Amino acid sequence: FERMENKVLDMEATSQAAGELAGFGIENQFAQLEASSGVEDELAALKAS
Amino acid sequence: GLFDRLGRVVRANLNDLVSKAEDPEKVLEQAVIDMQEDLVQLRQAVARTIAEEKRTEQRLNQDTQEAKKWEDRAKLALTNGEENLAREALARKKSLTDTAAAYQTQLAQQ
Amino acid sequence: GLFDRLGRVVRANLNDLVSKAEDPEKVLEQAVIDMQEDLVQLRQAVARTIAEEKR
Amino acid sequence: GLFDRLGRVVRANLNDLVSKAEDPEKVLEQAVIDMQEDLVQLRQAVARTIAEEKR
Amino acid sequence: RTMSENLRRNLAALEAKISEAKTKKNMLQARAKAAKANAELQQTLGGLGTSSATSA
Amino acid sequence: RTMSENLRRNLAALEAKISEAKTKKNMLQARAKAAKANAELQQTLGGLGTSSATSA
């Protein structure tokens, strides 16, 4: 029975990939990266004052 | 009789009246919304497919580290001078290593 | 038969009448209030996740 | 169907009629009186917290 | 010792056939559900026919 | 002493498998509830489709 519940673990693993069939992936989170690196750049430029 | 082939052309008169309405998009929408409900299950099916692929992949990872454990208990045996236990561990790993190869082929098709 | 594809375009006539109403925000509100109830549980789920992380 | 998104905009018509009433304070009062009953227990909770701190 | 070792052949066969049948259960079930999706991909190539049915 | 020490192997195995199963219970339960939330994050990527259903 526990092993069947591990197949629910495989279902959640499927579900985290599933956004890609909906056209969501790393290309979305990549924006927050390009942004957050820019946030560190401007906070560094501020503290350089 | 000819009246049946006439039946196609009088239904084509109706088809002319409804074509003259010219609001085509409405069925385009119908088509794409029906496929969206399927698509969420379809991506789920892809995910299930990947999930068997993964459950197998972690298994193969678990196998290949367990194969090292038998080789490690064999290294202990070899360095101790316990070759009988090294050969027991040698049987265990070979059995595992071939099952690992089977899972590798199962993943390859997956 | 063609009458079914006509069914999409006559429902598009209705869609024109309701589009002509032009008060779009009301559904925008519906969308964001539904997600707020989920969001309080969603943050809770994040918190549960952190809670296992903490324990 | 479009009629559901129209449902948000016809409820927005009602929202316009009630906004036009312009007597906003009444709900401001509701909000602050509800929190006062909680606040007396909330300060009590702070006090309980301090009380364990004191004991 | 002679017949006992033949019992070890027999037991080695029992575990081999049973364990292999278990990996067949995984492979076949997975392949079956996967095949239902792949059949739906063929049907989705057929979905182009279902849109054609009013594209006219 | 010889067979008794094999009972110590056996007891060491009992506690090892049981204790590991207890940490699996924590990890799996946590991972399961977490996965329900992560599935709701995939669904929230799908929430963009639910708004699209009247954004038209």
Numbering used by the authors:
A (entry chain 0): 168 to 216
B (entry chain 0): 2 to 111
C (entry chain 0), D (entry chain 0): 2 to 56
E (entry chain 0), F (entry chain 0): 112 to 167
List sentences quoted exactly from the publication behind this structure.
A prominent member of the PspA family is the vesicle-inducing protein in plastids 1 (Vipp1), also known as IM30 (inner membrane-associated protein of 30 kDa). Vesicle-inducing protein in plastids 1 (Vipp1) is critical for thylakoid membrane biogenesis and maintenance. Vipp1 appears to have two functions: in membrane maintenance (that is, during heat or light stress) and in thylakoid membrane (TM) biogenesis and/or remodeling. Vipp1 binds to negatively charged membranes and membrane binding depends on stored curvature elastic stress.
Using single-particle-based helical reconstruction, we resolved the structures of type I tubes at 5.1-Å resolution and two structures of type II tubes at 7.0-Å and 7.1-Å resolution. The type I and II tubes differ in their diameter and the arrangement of the monomers relative to the tube axis, as well as the diameter and thickness of the engulfed lipid bilayer tube. In contrast to the Vipp1 rings, the monomer orientation of the α1−α3 hairpin with respect to the tube axis is the same over the whole length of the tubes. Nevertheless, the monomer orientation among the tubes differs; in type I tubes, the α1−α3 hairpins are oriented parallel to the tube axis, while, in type II tubes, the hairpins are tilted approximately 45° relative to the tube axis. Remarkably, from rings over type II tubes to type I tubes, the α1−α3 hairpins accommodate a wide range of orientations along the tubulated membrane axis from perpendicular to parallel (from 90° to 0°) while essentially maintaining the same intermolecular contacts to stabilize the assembly. The here-determined structures of Vipp1 polymers in the presence of membranes indicated that helix α0 is immersed in the outer lipid leaflet of the bilayer. However, in contrast to SynPspA helix α0 that protrudes toward the bilayer, Vipp1 α0 lies flat in the membrane plane and appears to be partially submerged into the outer bilayer leaflet. The bilayer thickness in all three Vipp1 tubes remained nearly identical at 35 Å, although the inner leaflet radius changed with the tube diameter. Nevertheless, the same or similar intermolecular interactions of α0 with another α0 and α1 + α4, as observed previously in Vipp1 rings, are present in type I and II tubes.
